[PDB]
């Protein structure tokens, strides 16, 4: 409900309100009230009034480089959000605003015609950014401001919201001056795992903050939205480019080697709900490197991803699907295979640059590219040698592929009745204590004991150990000790009339490192 | 109802979604987060709907999930939880569900007025407004383990529901579960750091202006029922005294031709303290927590901070930083006692108020300036900061008059908000004999609705491949370059608008032009 003159008076008198998280533009989500937008200028507008708030209040640093990233690609310099400022009183010189009736979430889709970019840059961050703020998942309308059309996967964006998303182009239709009484701007990066090579060569994100569990909860949500509730291997085909040239030979060979039905699927020629149905029950997913492989996130736990790379493309340099499959909690096996036989690759040098052609380059650079046996490391996004090799077609050497798969999948592929427990961490040890005794000028003993972590009272853990770090109060040197018991008497290099700092942490099953307790100060 | 809530918790488990890439800028939204009253541990129960964002593995203990106070990375102020399977609930008492949406935080020092306002009240006010529904519906839970403290009435003004302390949680039951809880406080409003790693001083990159301070102050004033010119002296009574109090009041009143008034926290209600400050033309006080009330002063008022002997005003600047914040619009004058006759050292008092070597004690009164030091128990600083001081009145009046020429306060002063230019529009360029390059642009869109005293354009001429440029400052909306220009060369032209010399706007899309 909106009482229009009341809303206009609040806006005109009080102006825009802005509260944002983060100390950097790359780590920032903003909550706005009475944020406006000129659809003529395509600029957002902060109106200064008597209730205005700007947090952060950045001064000239608001353009160094911008207020926040509007896509989830870090610090991309065509994806920034900012606004222009006016006094709220300038409203008297402007057309009367149209008030947007819905709470908004405002963001840029990074590359909405690419299925992988859709899921990784947009859908997963949309899903969880909505869940960052109470009431947004149910109430928000999505506003995509990057300037693209619907694109090939608009119906996937529609699943994330009960309301129809709006595009920038549709905003001028609503009116010349639009005002959002309530709007959130930006997308969390917490679910991203890959970076596309804008500063250094593409590869896994440096500090990944998402696990397979949060991927699978999102996948479960989308499967319900798609009305998706004997074992087989699934070959994910492409029909337009980057072909598997011996697909028929591949299907039969995989069936004979693994004793399983083998089926084909493509994006071009199945409804997406049907694609998800097939992937979500598959024991193994075989595919050329490419966007269709992002559907690996729907595979059941314990399935295998087999990713094929064309001639001169090193699998280790192009790891978005390796990174997804091996993410903790994803529980997918991952196998990479690379065509190393030049007679099994087909080149397309006369295609446009977009499709990997090289006919537009110098004869010299064409010759260097063709004699090149491995794509050099490169930056995003139109490196000619990369596009030339990635758009090759591939005749797959079957016996090497099977050998490659068999080094990872020992026997049957897929989740053969495995049960998956979540791994959780120890709490702090409790009530750490120590006492000392002295035997002579250079000989003393330091006895330490502690109680189990509190959460261990309610757990049954295969292997519980304690790591103790011993440090003399004046030194930067420490000695760590691995212990099975809840106590120990240290002797080596322990001196009388000396103060030692003792840190203790619990460790479950070798790899699950718990927190250190507060330091224990021990004087001999 | 209870059985529905218990089932959701038991089958589904805890759900966590947090902002921020590091623990020092992290705010978390939790559903079905629980708490053991006996262990004083928050509990994350893993169930079939559990979500953990960020999912940090062992890095959740390096050092922790988030800061529970706004003091950055303070190793006694971390938040974390311990983990259990949801099924472990069978070994526990039935949970007590907290039905209110909670906001969980630590108060850093609830007995110090400056810490109360800077570390807690401002961050609480705007953290509540970071998330829809919180400001009106949230109950605050203070988990640091201190009691109500001397300023609990102020914390209560920040919420309609009564805040709960950690002790009152244990009383509600052995196992408490929050159906909906936010954890952490934004640091966006802080401006000072207390010297835990490097000597105390202003925060490196301050993200708050006086406007947001004053919007908060306006809220508090209405909550205190607070809507003839005078100078206000903020007295301390128990320690860090001003000894020539009466002579100070009369000297101030005679020189500035204005009423003078003495105020104190102990003898007035805080509402009346704020009333007095809110319309004071000058606020004179010893360095101390009461000076945080300067955020209530009217625009154009003057802050006069008196520092005892051997305490350099440039080393202890929480109130200078506040007074001189962009948009605070307060004059700041610091006065330091340079005369040892007027200082009154108290070596006899306990270490609490500043027992060591006579060798170390000898150096302490042999020093003229307290050295730069780290928090928090430096007796050299605590001895000197707790002295009483007799104010040299001609020396103070003189250094005030260096800043305040005439009569102080908001006398016939008008402040505008400083707005920045938008991008210039429709930038064009045209190259050419002699190589030449011409550029033109239209005014920023927002300039169409503004009256600005001075509009300039800064233009950067860059040769492609060079990591440098030649800058030009122009009044016109067009230019022809003659100096640098070479034939058959691609140049990049960057343009930004500048209002009144210091309001730099953004650069437009770069112009690429080749000769």
């Amino acid at each position: 409900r909106i009482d229009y003159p009341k809303a206009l008076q609040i806006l005109t008198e009080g102006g825009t309100h802005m509260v944002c998280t983060g100390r950097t533009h790359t780590d920032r989500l903003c909550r706005f009230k009475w944020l406006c937008y000129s659809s003529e200028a395509e600029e957002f507008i902060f109106f200064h009034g008597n209730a205005s708030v700007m947090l952060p209040s950045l001064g000239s640093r608001r353009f160094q480089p911008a207020l926040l990233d509007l896509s989830t690609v870090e610090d991309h310099n065509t994806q920034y959000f900012n606004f222009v400022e006016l006094p709220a009183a300038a409203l008297r010189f402007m057309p009367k605003p149209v008030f947007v009736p819905d709470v908004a979430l405002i963001a840029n889709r990074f590359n909405p015609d690419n299925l992988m970019h859709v899921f990784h840059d947009d859908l997963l961050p949309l899903f969880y950014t909505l869940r960052q703020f109470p009431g947004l998942a149910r109430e928000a309308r999505l506003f995509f401001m990057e300037g693209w059309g619907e694109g090939a996967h608009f119906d996937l964006y529609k699943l994330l919201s009960p309301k129809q998303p709006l595009l920038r182009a549709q905003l001028k239709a609503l009116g010349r001056l639009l005002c959002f009484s309530h709007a959130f701007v930006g997308l969390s990066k917490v679910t991203t795992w890959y970076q596309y090579g804008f500063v250094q060569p593409q590869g896994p994100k440096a500090n990944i903050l998402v696990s397979g569990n949060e991927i699978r909860q999102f996948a479960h949500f989308l499967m319900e939205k798609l009305n998706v509730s004997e074992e087989y291997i699934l070959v994910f085909s492409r029909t337009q480019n980057r072909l598997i040239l011996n697909e028929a030979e591949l299907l039969l060979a995989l069936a004979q080697e693994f004793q399983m039905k083998t089926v084909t699927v493509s994006l071009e020629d199945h409804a997406f709900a049907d694609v998800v149905r097939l992937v979500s029950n598959a024991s193994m997913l075989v595919s050329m490197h490419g966007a269709q492989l992002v559907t690996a996130l729907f595979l059941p736990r314990g399935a295998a991803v087999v990713e094929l790379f064309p001639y001169a493309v090193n699998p280790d340099h192009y790891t978005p699907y390796k990174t997804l499959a091996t993410l903790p909690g994803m529980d997918l096996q991952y196998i990479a295979w690379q065509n190393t036989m030049p007679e099994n690759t087909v080149t397309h040098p006369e295609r446009p640059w977009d499709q990997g052609g090289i006919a537009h380059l110098d004869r010299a650079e064409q010759a260097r590219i063709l004699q090149s046996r491995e794509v050099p490391r490169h930056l995003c996004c139109r490196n000619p040698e990369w596009l030339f090799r990635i758009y090759q077609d591939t005749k797959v050497d079957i016996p090497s592929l099977i050998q490659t798969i068999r080094r990872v999948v020992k026997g049957h592929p897929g989740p053969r009745k495995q049960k998956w427990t979540v791994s959780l961490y120890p709490g702090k040890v409790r009530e750490a204590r120590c006492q000392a005794s002295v035997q002579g000028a250079s000989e003393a003993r330091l006895s330490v004991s502690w109680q189990i972590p509190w959460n261990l009272k309610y757990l049954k853990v295969r292997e519980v150990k304690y790591e103790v770090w011993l440090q003399e109060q004046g030194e930067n040197t420490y000695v760590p000790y691995m212990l099975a018991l809840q106590n120990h008497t240290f002797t080596e290099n322990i001196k009388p009339f000396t103060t030692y700092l003792v840190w203790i942490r619990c460790i479950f099953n070798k790899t699950l490192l718990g927190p250190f307790a507060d330091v224990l100060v021990c004087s001999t | 109802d209870y059985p529905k809530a218990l089932q959701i918790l038991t089958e589904g488990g805890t759900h966590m979604v947090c902002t921020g890439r590091t623990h020092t800028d992290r705010l978390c939204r939790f559903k079905w987060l629980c708490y053991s009253s006996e262990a004083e541990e928050f509990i994350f129960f893993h169930g079939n709907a559990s979500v953990m964002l960020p999912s940090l593995g062992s890095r959740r203990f390096q050092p922790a999930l988030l800061d529970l106070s706004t003091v950055e990375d303070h190793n006694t102020q971390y938040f974390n939880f311990v983990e259990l399977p949801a099924a472990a609930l069978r070994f526990m008492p039935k949970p007590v569900f907290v039905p209110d949406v909670a906001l969980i935080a630590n108060r850093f020092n609830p007995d110090n007025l400056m810490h109360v306002f800077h570390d807690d009240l401002l961050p609480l006010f705007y953290t509540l407004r970071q998330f829809p529904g919180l400001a009106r519906e949230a109950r605050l839970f203070f988990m640091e383990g201190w009691g109500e403290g001397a300023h609990f009435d102020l914390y209560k003004l920040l919420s309609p529901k009564q805040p709960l302390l950690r002790a009152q949680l244990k009383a509600l039951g052995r196992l408490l579960c929050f159906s909906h809880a936010f954890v952490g406080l934004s640091k966006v409003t802080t401006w000072y750091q207390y010297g835990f790693v490097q000597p105390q001083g202003p925060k490196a990159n301050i993200l708050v202006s006086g406007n947001e301070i004053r919007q908060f102050a306006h809220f508090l004033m209405e909550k205190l029922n607070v809507s003839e010119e005078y100078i206000l002296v903020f007295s301390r009574t128990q320690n860090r005294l001003i000894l020539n109090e009466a002579e100070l009041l009369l000297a101030l009143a005679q020189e500035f031709q204005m009423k003078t008034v003495t105020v104190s926290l102990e003898d007035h209600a805080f509402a009346d303290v704020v009333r007095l400050v809110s319309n004071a033309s000058m606020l004179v006080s010893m360095h101390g927590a009461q000076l945080v009330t300067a955020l209530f002063l009217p625009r154009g008022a003057a802050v006069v901070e008196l520092f005892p002997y051997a305490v350099n005003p440039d080393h202890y600047t929480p109130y200078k930083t506040l007074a001189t914040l962009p948009g605070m619009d307060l004059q700041y004058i610091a006065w330091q006692n340079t005369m040892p006759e007027n200082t009154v050292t108290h070596p006899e008092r306990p270490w609490d108020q500043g027992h060591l070597d006579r060798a170390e004690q000898a150096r302490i009164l042999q020093s003229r300036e307290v050295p730069r030091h780290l928090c928090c128990r430096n007796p050299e600083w605590l001895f000197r900061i707790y002295q009483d001081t007799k104010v040299d009145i001609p020396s103070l009046i003189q250094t005030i008059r260096r800043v305040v020429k005439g009569h102080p306060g908001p006398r016939k002063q008008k402040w505008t908000v400083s707005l920045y230019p938008g991008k210039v529009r429709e930038a064009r360029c045209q190259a050419s004999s002699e190589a030449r390059l011409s550029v033109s642009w239209q005014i920023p869109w927002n300039l169409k609705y503004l009256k600005v005293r001075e509009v300039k354009y800064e233009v950067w001429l860059q040769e492609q491949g060079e990591n440098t440029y030649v800058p030009y400052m122009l009044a016109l909306q067009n230019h022809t370059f003659t100096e640098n220009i070479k034939p058959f060369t691609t140049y990049l032209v960057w343009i930004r608008c500048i209002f009144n010399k210091t309001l730099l706007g953004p650069f437009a899309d770069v112009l690429v032009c080749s000769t």
Partner: peptide, 12 residues
Amino acid sequence: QTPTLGPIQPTR
């Protein structure tokens, strides 16, 4: 078509 960076402004 992946969004490419605009030119980087000189660091000097």
